[PDB]
């Protein structure tokens, strides 16, 4: 099918290989988003990263995960076609003038974590969660998006993956300290950051370098040390990258304004040792999420 089959309305994002566009399907009337994938002025053909994103998307069939309707072409680029979503999460929060109730957040996190558990059960790591890659329409419905850094991971044994992943502010400490044999716990750390940012509106760790990011995380979650995370000494940058002082965990005193069931979840999601961090399956049995319609 061709892109003349759609009515283009305007630009609603920058994706990694082209803009995203809002549009109307001429046969059905429905509103859709079109991720452009530019080719002309490419050196190794259709971008291998796009090929990777597309294989993954085609396997993902979940209510709380973005679902690609089709791919179309010019009269020369291609466009990935998705059902349109009114906002991303970063957009609502940044205006301010938007407060999320305890129950808005409950609903929102149940959806996200069911989204993420589906992905993890099917051996995919998202590896780029953050407020701008969570979409949200006015029905109150959530979709997890941008699988442009995702990849298959191996659960029957362990393997080495790319270390520089997840944007700084949602990046967990194992990656800051240089780990390559990491786990789905990296996605849960990022979602833990969302949960905090839902209650404050400001993203909770906002440094511009890794070293400073580590400081900010330590200062709240405790300095990483072998007493709380025995394996930590086996990481490449544990000697190289230290917080100033050896800080005590004080997450609960900082976030004691939050409801208590949420605080338990948040504490668990932002646990330094990945093997002690909760899984997406586990979050869904927490008291905060256990019973949410």
């Amino acid at each position: 099918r061709c892109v003349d089959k759609f009515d283009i309305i305007g630009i609603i994002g920058e994706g990694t290989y082209g803009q995203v566009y809002k549009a109307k399907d001429k046969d059905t009337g429905e509103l859709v988003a079109l991720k452009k994938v530019r080719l002309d002025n490419e050196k190794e053909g259709f971008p291998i990263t796009a090929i990777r994103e597309i294989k993954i998307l085609r396997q993902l069939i979940h209510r709380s995960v973005v679902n690609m309707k089709e791919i179309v072409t010019d009269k020369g680029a291609f466009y990935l076609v998705f059902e349109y979503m009114d906002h991303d999460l970063m957009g609502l929060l940044e205006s301010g003038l938007v407060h999320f109730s305890e129950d808005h957040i409950k609903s929102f996190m149940k959806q996200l974590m069911e989204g993420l558990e589906y992905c993890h059960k099917k051996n995919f790591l998202h590896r780029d969660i953050k407020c701008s890659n969570i979409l949200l329409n006015n029905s109150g419905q959530i979709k997890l998006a941008d699988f442009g850094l995702a990849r298959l991971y191996n659960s029957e044994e362990s393997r080495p993956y790319t270390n520089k992943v997840i944007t700084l502010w949602y990046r967990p400490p194992e990656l800051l300290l240089g780990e390559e044999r990491y786990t789905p716990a990296i996605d849960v750390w990022s979602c833990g950051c969302i949960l905090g940012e839902l209650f404050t509106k400001k993203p909770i760790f906002q440094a511009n370098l890794e070293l400073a990011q580590l400081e900010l995380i330590s200062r709240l979650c405790g300095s990483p040390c072998p007493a709380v995370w025995p394996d930590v000494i086996k990481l490449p940058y544990f000697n190289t990258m230290k917080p100033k002082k050896q800080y005590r965990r004080r997450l609960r005193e900082e976030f004691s304004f939050i409801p208590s069931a949420a605080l338990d979840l948040l504490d668990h999601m932002l646990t330094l040792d990945p093997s002690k961090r909760c899984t997406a399956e586990q979050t869904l049995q927490s008291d905060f999420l256990k019973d949410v319609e």
């Binding site: 053909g45 259709f46 291998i48 090929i51 990777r52 294989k55 085609r58 396997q59 072409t73 291609f78």
Partner: protein, 238 residues
């Protein structure tokens, strides 16, 4: 999408509407597939990438004709894309060098003034033609899973697998991947191997008293389908 045809509808290609006789089409298919196999093998690419590329090649020519798309160019394009899909990417420059090393001046003429451009251009079309259904499984993975579950003489079982493996490589020159799912091709090459080595395969299954040993691996496969697949593969050696 559905990527499987009856034998009746396979003979009705774009190349046949356009005047090409079946013998020549069948020859152009074998030459192309072997070309993909030879180029990939020389680049060190391994069996799933080669097979993916050959599948794209076979599918592509159910929608376009050889008179319009010269086969060695299409082959190189299918392999190039397969490498990306199977996460064993190769640079287009290296696929051309290797192609050139295997072709002669006439054959390589198909690539034209800008060999690289001719391939990149074709990739847009290839992707459209295969409807971006990029994921493909092959018989090898099922040959190994099914054979691993037999229990009995290890040497005989290994010989069986090894013969069956070669028979998979051979099947790829044919349109068998457009007729039957890889699960079925696997069972068939095992069955063929079985006949030629004169191994009773049921004796290595949990149930030595059932003829249809394959039913534990795939359900619902008539013996005449396996016979049919066997006959087609054997035709290559006649």
């Amino acid at each position: 999408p559905c990527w499987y045809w009856d034998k009746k509808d396979l003979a009705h290609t774009p190349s046949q509407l356009e005047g090409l006789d079946p013998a020549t089409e069948a020859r152009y298919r074998r030459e192309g597939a072997r070309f993909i196999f030879d180029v990939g093998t020389r680049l060190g690419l391994h069996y799933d990438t080669l097979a993916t590329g050959i599948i794209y090649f076979h599918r592509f020519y159910m929608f376009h004709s050889f008179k319009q798309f010269p086969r060695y160019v299409t082959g190189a394009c299918c392999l190039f894309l397969a490498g990306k899909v199977e996460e064993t990417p190769k640079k287009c420059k290296d696929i051309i060098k290797t192609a050139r090393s295997l072709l002669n001046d006439v054959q390589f003429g198909q690539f034209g003034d800008d060999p690289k451009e001719e391939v990149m251009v074709l990739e847009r079309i290839l992707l459209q033609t295969i409807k971006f259904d990029l994921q493909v499984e092959h018989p090898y993975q099922f040959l190994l899973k099914y054979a691993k579950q037999l229990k009995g003489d290890k040497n005989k079982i290994q010989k069986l697998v090894q013969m069956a493996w070669t028979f998979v490589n051979d099947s790829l020159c044919t349109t068998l991947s457009l007729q039957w799912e890889p699960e079925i091709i696997a069972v068939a090459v095992m069955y063929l191997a079985g006949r030629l080595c004169k191994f009773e395969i049921q004796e290595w299954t949990s149930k030595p008293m059932y003829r249809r040993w394959w039913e534990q691996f795939v359900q619902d496969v008539p013996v005449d389908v396996l016979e049919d697949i066997c006959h087609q593969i054997l035709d290559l050696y006649s």
